[PDB]
Amino acid sequence: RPRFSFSIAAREGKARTGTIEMKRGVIRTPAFMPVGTGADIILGNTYHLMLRPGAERIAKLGGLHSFMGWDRPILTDSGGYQVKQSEEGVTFKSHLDGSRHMLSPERSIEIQHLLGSDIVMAFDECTPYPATPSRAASSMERSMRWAKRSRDAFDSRKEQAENAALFGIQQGSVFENLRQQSADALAEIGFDGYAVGGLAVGEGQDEMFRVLDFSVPMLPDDKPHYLMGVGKPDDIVGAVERGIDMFDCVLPTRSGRNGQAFTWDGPINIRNARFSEDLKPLDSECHCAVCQKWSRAYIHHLIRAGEILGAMLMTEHNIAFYQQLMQKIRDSISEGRFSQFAQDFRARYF
Amino acid sequence: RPRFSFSIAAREGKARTGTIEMKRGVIRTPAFMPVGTGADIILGNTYHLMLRPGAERIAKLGGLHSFMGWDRPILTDSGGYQVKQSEEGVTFKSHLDGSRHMLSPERSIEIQHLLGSDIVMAFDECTPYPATPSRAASSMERSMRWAKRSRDAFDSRKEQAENAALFGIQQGSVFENLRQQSADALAEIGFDGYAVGGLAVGEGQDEMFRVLDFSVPMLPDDKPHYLMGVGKPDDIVGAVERGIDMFDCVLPTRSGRNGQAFTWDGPINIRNARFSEDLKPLDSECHCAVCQKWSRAYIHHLIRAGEILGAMLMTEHNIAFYQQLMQKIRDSISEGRFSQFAQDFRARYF
Numbered sequence: 001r002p003r004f005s006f007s008i009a010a011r012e013g014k015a016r017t018g019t020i021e022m023k024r025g026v027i028r029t030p031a032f033m034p035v036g037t038g039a040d041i042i043l044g045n046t047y048h049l050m051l052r053p054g055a056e057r058i059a060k061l062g063g064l065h066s067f068m069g070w071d072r073p074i075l076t077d078s079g080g081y082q083v084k085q086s087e088e089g090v091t092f093k094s095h096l097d098g099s100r101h102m103l104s105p106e107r108s109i110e111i112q113h114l115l116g117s118d119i120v121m122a123f124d125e126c127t128p129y130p131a132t133p134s135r136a137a138s139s140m141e142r143s144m145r146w147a148k149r150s151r152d153a154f155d156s157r158k159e160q161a162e163n164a165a166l167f168g169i170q171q172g173s174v175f176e177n178l179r180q181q182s183a184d185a186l187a188e189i190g191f192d193g194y195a196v197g198g199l200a201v202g203e204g205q206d207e208m209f210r211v212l213d214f215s216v217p218m219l220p221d222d223k224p225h226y227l228m229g230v231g232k233p234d235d236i237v238g239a240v241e242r243g244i245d246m247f248d249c250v251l252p253t254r255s256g257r258n259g260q261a262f263t264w265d266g267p268i269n270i271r272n273a274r275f276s277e278d279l280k281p282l283d284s285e286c287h288c289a290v291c292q293k294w295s296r297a298y299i300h301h302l303i304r305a306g307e308i309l310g311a312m313l314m315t316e317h318n319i320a321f322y323q324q325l326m327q328k329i330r331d332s333i334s335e336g337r338f339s340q341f342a343q344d345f346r347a348r349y350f
Numbered sequence: 351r352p353r354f355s356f357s358i359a360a361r362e363g364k365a366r367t368g369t370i371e372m373k374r375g376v377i378r379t380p381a382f383m384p385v386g387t388g389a390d391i392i393l394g395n396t397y398h399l400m401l402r403p404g405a406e407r408i409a410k411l412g413g414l415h416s417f418m419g420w421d422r423p424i425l426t427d428s429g430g431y432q433v434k435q436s437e438e439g440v441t442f443k444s445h446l447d448g449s450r451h452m453l454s455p456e457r458s459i460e461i462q463h464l465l466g467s468d469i470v471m472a473f474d475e476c477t478p479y480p481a482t483p484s485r486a487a488s489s490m491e492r493s494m495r496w497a498k499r500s501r502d503a504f505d506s507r508k509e510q511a512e513n514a515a516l517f518g519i520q521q522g523s524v525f526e527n528l529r530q531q532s533a534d535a536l537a538e539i540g541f542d543g544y545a546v547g548g549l550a551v552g553e554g555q556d557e558m559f560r561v562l563d564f565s566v567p568m569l570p571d572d573k574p575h576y577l578m579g580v581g582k583p584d585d586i587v588g589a590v591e592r593g594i595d596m597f598d599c600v601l602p603t604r605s606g607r608n609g610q611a612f613t614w615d616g617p618i619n620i621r622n623a624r625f626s627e628d629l630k631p632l633d634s635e636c637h638c639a640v641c642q643k644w645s646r647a648y649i650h651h652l653i654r655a656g657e658i659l660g661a662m663l664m665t666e667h668n669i670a671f672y673q674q675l676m677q678k679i680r681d682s683i684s685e686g687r688f689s690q691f692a693q694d695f696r697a698r699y700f
């Protein structure tokens with residue numbers, strides 16, 4: 001397969017469906033990328049892995065793919081969002097054993113290289129919400145400078161340039177002129193994919209969607225658009241409606257460990273007593289393995305008993321719900337009925 | 351299949367291998383019965399289930415088999431070992447919501463009936479270790495009276511008598527005359543199986559084996575012998591050498607949640623730094639699913655990262671190790687080489 005080939009097979013309104021081809025596999029889009037721990041690609045947390053066991057160590061152990069036994073594509077973040085600051089980058093000391101750490105566009109790239117990622121994220125500067133226009137512009141401009149450094153560092157490592165892909169990240173907070181500036185800088189540098197950054201910060205769906213309505217058409221139409229940190233099922237459906245192709249969110253896993261299950265009728269809190277005698281599966285349309293075999297009542301019980309198996313079935317369910325959702329979105333766009341699906345989705349979910 | 355048919359296919363010294371046939375399936379012996387949460391039979395905790403969700407409720411929900419989705423045989427304990435005392439039984443208040451509870455040979459039987467167990471344990475009186483001969487004799491005599499009440503209550507419930515089986519429990523602490531007395535009472539009442547009770551109480555392997563050497567031949571040879579609460583891999587091999595056919599122990603699951611893995615080279619503490627870069631699977635001969643796919647180094651990492659998946663792989667590994675051990679014991683006895691296996695087992699395990 002090629003290093004990277006994005007192809008759009010069908011469209012409806014702003015929504016798109018198609019595929020990304022890479023050496024380690026094909027990624028069907030719109031895509032949900034679960035955390036490392038039906039998916040075509042998963043996410044590696046660079047910041048976490050850098051702290052334990054370390055990037056050198058993971059490289060020594062054969063790379064991330066062999067380490068976690070996953071031989072399909074992997075997307076790593078830059079590590080900075082999770083993180084002594086300056087134009088050069090950032091230095092921090094580890095909480096695990098006080099070791100001193102430095103992150104920069106160059107060092108971030110090097111670390112994702114050591115990890116062996118297939119999709120590398122440029123290193124940028126988080127923009128707090130809310131931000132003044134002044135602060136948003138200053139942060140965005142530094143991010144675009146860091147985007148150029150990331151590109152160069154990526155391109156100077158032959159093995160990465162030839163087998164991996166680089167995404168640039170749009171910043172600019174919620175201001176349209178800054179977003180446009182950011183989009184133009186990014187396209188002038190040129191990347192394999194364009195992420196929309198800065199929108200997973202407590203702004204509320206309304207504002208998120210507003211900023212996506214003008215932000216996504218600024219990005220190159222023939223490249224994948226990645227909405228970082230998003231999100232709930234209804235955020236995904238609305239962002240796909242606005243042109244996003246890729247998503248990641250800790251929601252399924254965390255929800256999975258704190259007793260919450262996603263269903264087509266809305267999220268449910270399975271620890272609630274109203275589920276104690278409910279013989280229906282987690283979700284009635286879910287084709288997932290948990291859903292095949294066990295009832296809400298038994299999972300309620302598991303979790304209530306503090307049994308580990310319960311959180312496990314819950315997480316497995318949630319992960320599978322998210323992939324079925326993306327599958328329903330792909331098929332609906334491909335069939336010219338995504339507009340309908342979305343409306344039916346909401347009526348029932350809410 | 352019959353209600354209950356125990357058949358001994360082969361012998362070596364005191365060890366036996368064969369099968370138990372019941373309506374819901376065949377149980378190959380010597381057997382390890384894991385907790386509800388390769389096994390031919392599992393264990394239900396009666397005391398726990400009685401407190402949550404309740405026996406009535408589980409019956410309402412279709413019985414334990416349908417509730418946990420397990421359609422093979424299930425053995426339930428009496429509930430008293432986990433537990434206001436008198437010759438009639440015992441009353442206790444729940445810690446979950448202060449509800450008042452009573453246990454007795456009759457009520458224990460009724461509850462295991464409501465749970466739908468295939469193998470029912472008579473209700474007896476735990477004997478603390480150490481015990482004076484006087485106290486051991488008094489506790490044993492009450493247990494044999496309770497054994498007769500359990501038999502009668504079991505026999506007065508047509509559905510149980512016809513589709514389930516009852517085991518009696520030998521008591522008597524570590525005194526041989528009491529054990530013999532207990533064995534004779536039990537055989538005079540008559541049960542489908544005979545458990546050896548009172549030996550999972552911190553006495554140390556030496557004393558356990560000593561008491562098994564004279565206790566097991568007192569039980570009827572043509573019925574299964576169940577060693578309750580035992581145990582570590584090396585306790586099982588030695589108790590099989592002394593004539594036991596059935597075992598249960600929380601070891602695999604708990605060990606599984608507290609970072610400890612069983613291997614043919616002894617238990618390992620996977621959280622230890624010496625495993626951080628170990629690419630070997632949990633155990634090299636283990637055919638288990640974890641062992642297929644993941645390294646000690648990645649499971650070390652999982653657990654160190656607090657990830658739930660890790661404890662899950664560990665427990666799965668431990669459960670599978672125990673079934674492979676029982677399988678190795680069955681085959682070795684059937685082949686006339688159990689004496690050899692046991693010696694080789696120890697050399698490597700220790």
Ligand SMILES: [Zn+2]
Binds near residue numbers: 289291292317
């Ligand atoms: Zn499901």
Ligand SMILES: [Zn+2]
Binds near residue numbers: 633
């Ligand atoms: Zn294994």
